[PDB]
Amino acid sequence: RLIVVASLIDKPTNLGGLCRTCEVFGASVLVVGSLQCISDKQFQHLSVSAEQWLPLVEVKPPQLIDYLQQKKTEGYTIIGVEQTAKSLDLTQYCFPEKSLLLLGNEREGIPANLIQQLDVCVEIPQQGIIRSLNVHVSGALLIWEYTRQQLLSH
Amino acid sequence: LGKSISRLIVVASLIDKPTNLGGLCRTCEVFGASVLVVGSLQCISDKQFQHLSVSAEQWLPLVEVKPPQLIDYLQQKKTEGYTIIGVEQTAKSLDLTQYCFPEKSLLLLGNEREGIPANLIQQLDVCVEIPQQGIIRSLNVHVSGALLIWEYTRQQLLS
Ligand SMILES: Nc1ncnc2c1ncn2[C@@H]1O[C@H](CSCC[C@H](N)C(=O)O)[C@@H](O)[C@H]1O
Ligand SMILES: Nc1ncnc2c1ncn2[C@@H]1O[C@H](CSCC[C@H](N)C(=O)O)[C@@H](O)[C@H]1O
């Protein structure tokens, strides 16, 4: 199933929100940059106890390359969630069963050294003038789309 | 070539928290909703709203419909050919995975605490729910709205 990697995300509100969404959709694991975030009050406000029920794993940003390489060997497709020239449109993207979603930092997105390690980048198409979506919302949309496709395939 | 007029209406009048309203404002702008309806335009004056909306309020039409005026507003939109879709977990809700959105869709989101009140459930044409797998009872209301806005958008793009 689905691994969501939030190690690049800085804000406890985004992490806490994502924790709730991952739990609701039955993600296999949510990966965070520091287990300390789980006990942050802003995180807890948004996660509404989801952390009790969702597997959580710490992978610090410096360890991401090695972690993602290991997941490839286990049969995961490493999917960057990002707006890039080479990104595939989410409306056109059929998820592999073993999908891993890498979310970007709120300010910096996914850095070039990590883009290089990805199997694919997937982009949510936009119609308005605002540059991008919130990172938690972005992750929610891909988590949902993966889930929708899997429910329909099964 | 050519950008179609947006039919999608998102109604957030029942939502209380400025963080949810601001987040939803950004999402609605990004996906080109025709309008975001709010319970009070006071919300856009709030720093918490502004932090999350990232100026989207400058580009997305906002209209105020106070909750006591909601029934009249929804009735007028039916007259204009809108399907009034409650976004809510109920025994008669249609599963989002099986729901085909009409072009003129209006999404009514519930209050964070109270959901959609009974007097408004009466006014709905249909209720739509996002299926869940885990233990937690519900999604955040802005995230719920984002998922329906996305599914509406995906469906319209495929046709
Ligand atoms: N339309 C979209 N498609 C895919 N990811 C998106 C997205 N909008 C926001 N994101 C996600 O949210 C993160 C923070 S947004 C910051 C970078 C953004 N691409 C920019 O140039 O402004 C991104 O790194 C990505 O993971
Ligand atoms: N799975 C889901 N499907 C559809 N709407 C949902 C949803 N999860 C949350 N929502 C939306 O988010 C709002 C706040 S959740 C409101 C309280 C919730 N009914 C409870 O019992 O705890 C709802 O009114 C609805 O509009």
Structure characterization notes:
The structure is a homodimer. The first copy, chain A, is an alpha/beta fold. The first copy, chain A, has one domain (2-154): 3-Layer(aba) Sandwich (Alpha/beta knot), CATH 3.40.1280. Helices cover 34% and strands 17% of the residues of chain A. Chain A contains five helices and seven strands, in the order E-H-E-H-E-H-E-E-E-H-E-H. Chain A has helices spanning 12-24, 41-47, 64-73, 112-115, 135-153, and strands at residues 2-5, 29-32, 56-58, 77-81, 88-89, 99-102, 120-123. Chain A has a seven-stranded parallel sheet. In chain A, strand 2 (29-32), helix 2 and strand 3 (56-58) form a beta-alpha-beta unit. In chain A, helix 1 runs parallel beside helix 2 and helix 1 (12-24) packs parallel to helix 5 (135-153). The longest helix of chain A is centred in the last third of the chain and has 19 residues, at 135-153. At the A-B interface, helix 1 and helix 5 of A face helix 1 and helix 5 of B. Bound molecules: S-adenosyl-L-homocysteine (2 copies). One S-adenosyl-L-homocysteine is lined by residues 81-83, 103-104, 106, 109-110, 123-124, 126, 131-133, 135, 138 of chain A. Chain A: This is tRNA (guanosine(18)-2'-O)-methyltransferase TARBP1. Chain A: Monomer and homodimer.
